[PDB]
Design a protein around this ligand. Structure first.
Ligand code: NY7
Length: 171
């Protein structure tokens, strides 16, 4: 059985208990914390690509009102985000299982942009998700995994200073 685990869940849970925020910019901003995944049970000799996307956790616009995040009352169906290909892709199962798979180079933006950067709906809440795609082989296969611990609201600047402080303390 293919096992997928979050590395540094301890730290993600500290962010999640405050409501996590990730900055989006026109040019794109890297994530802190970085999503790092522990993977076991791959065929060391099989070929895989690691994909990252962001699911809109709900259909609402969120606003920081008197020290607290609150959802709007006017939902709107959320279009799926684009997929980021881990730059080590494609690679042998052995490569992926030898150290945590680290999505350190994904950049989050608020503007339709050249290549790489993943565009998000601003002030929407997101749940990171990976797809492990077995490629090249006869039988194509996809395994998906969500990371609720890593949920965040996309922001153009931090709203909760407690988040600002944690981001600096642990970077
Ligand atoms: C600013 O709009 C967006 C940017 C990025 C993504 C993933 C979705 C949307 N909008 C929607 O999904 C609304 N149909």
């Amino acid at each position: 059985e293919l096992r997928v685990g979050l590395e540094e869940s301890e730290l993600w849970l500290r962010f999640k208990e405050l409501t996590n925020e990730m900055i989006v910019t026109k040019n794109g901003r890297r994530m802190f914390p970085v999503l790092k995944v522990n993977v076991s049970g791959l065929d060391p000799n099989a070929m895989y690509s690691f994909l990252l996307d962001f699911v809109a956790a709900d259909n609402h616009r969120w606003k920081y009102v008197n020290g607290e995040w609150v959802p709007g009352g006017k939902p709107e169906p959320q279009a799926p985000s684009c997929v980021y290909i881990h730059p080590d892709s494609p690679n042998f199962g052995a490569h992926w299982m030898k150290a945590p798979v680290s999505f350190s180079k994904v950049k989050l933006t608020n503007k339709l942009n050249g290549g790489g950067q993943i565009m998000l709906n601003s002030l929407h809440k997101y749940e990171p998700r990976i797809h492990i795609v077995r490629v090249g082989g006869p039988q194509r296969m996809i395994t998906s995994h969500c990371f609720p611990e890593t949920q965040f609201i996309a922001v153009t600047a931090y709203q909760n200073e407690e988040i600002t402080a944690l981001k600096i303390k642990y970077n």
